[PDB]
Amino acid sequence: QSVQVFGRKKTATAVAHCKRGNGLIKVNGRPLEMIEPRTLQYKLLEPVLLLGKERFAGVDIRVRVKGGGHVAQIYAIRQSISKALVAYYQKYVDEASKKEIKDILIQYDRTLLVADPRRCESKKFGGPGARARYQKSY
């Protein structure tokens, strides 16, 4: 049983399976704070202290994430967690608390529950990159 909420950034995508619990947060065999980078750690911690530990104390959400790159796997765990919390609150308890948390998250970061649409652009022949071109002599 999941809140069916998902969350993406770049080709990466994360979903928070949700159940009734006491706010224990886990990410693919690990909790939310033992993630390897230890410098992107603040990016993962953004929600849990952006709105407080109390709101993350009555719901158990396990965030499964599949995608490329370290940082692109981030911005998916955090957004999935925040949007899963907002959807859980919206569909189960009420909207007033849900509306409050949504306003808080949007004010801190408007792209906290909306996906980042940008994707890597294709490459065109006669150049290595999307917009870079091969050097030639005049």
Binding site: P37, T39, L40, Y42, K43, L45, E46, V71, Y75, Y108
Partner: protein, 189 residues
């Protein structure tokens, strides 16, 4: 109640310049725990100036060779040298950086002569946005040249260059190039 990293506060900072305060963002809703957020600042005007000043400052850190595209390394070298300036001074690093930017952002310098002309240069006002751009660029470049061909490593040249720019020491590249820009502005009346 948002603090930069874990201990820097955003209530002890004050601009007291009135010239460039809307293009510096440290006390407003733009407060965050990690100087790494990507964002859509560089995809439109009237939205590029809403990036937090520390975010822009860490964004412009990486440059030259493979060093570009290593924003996480910039976060590390920014937590470093900021611990260093806070231990060297004891003051709040954000206010010191704001002082360095106010002291380093050029006010007036030369461009083309009004309607038309390219033989010489004519002095004009520098926009606050371009002046913070120039201040950040001089800070980064002076730091990386101070590290260049030197025994001392990174996270030092940033620290000393920033602290001299805040204080006005001529060993700072940012404010010496500032005074250079106003001297060209004066000499090109």
């Amino acid at each position: 109640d948002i603090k930069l990293f874990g201990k820097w506060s955003t209530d002890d900072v004050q601009i007291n310049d009135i010239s460039l305060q809307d293009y510096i963002a440290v006390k407003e809703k733009y407060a965050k725990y990690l100087p790494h957020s990507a964002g859509r600042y560089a995809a439109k005007r009237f939205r590029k100036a809403q990036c937090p000043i520390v975010e822009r400052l860490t964004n412009s850190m990486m440059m030259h060779g493979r060093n570009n595209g290593k924003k996480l390394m910039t976060v590390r070298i920014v937590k470093h040298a900021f611990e260093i300036i806070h231990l060297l001074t004891g003051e709040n690093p954000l206010q010191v950086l704001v002082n360095a930017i106010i002291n380093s952002g050029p006010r007036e310098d030369s461009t083309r002569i009004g309607r038309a002309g390219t033989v010489r240069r004519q002095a004009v006002d520098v926009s606050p946005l371009r002046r913070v751009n120039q201040a950040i660029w001089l800070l980064c470049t002076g730091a990386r040249e101070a590290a260049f061909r030197n025994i001392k490593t990174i996270a030092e040249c940033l620290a000393d260059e920033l602290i001299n720019a805040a204080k006005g020491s001529s060993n700072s590249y940012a404010i010496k190039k500032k005074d250079e820009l106003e001297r060209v502005a004066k000499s090109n009346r």
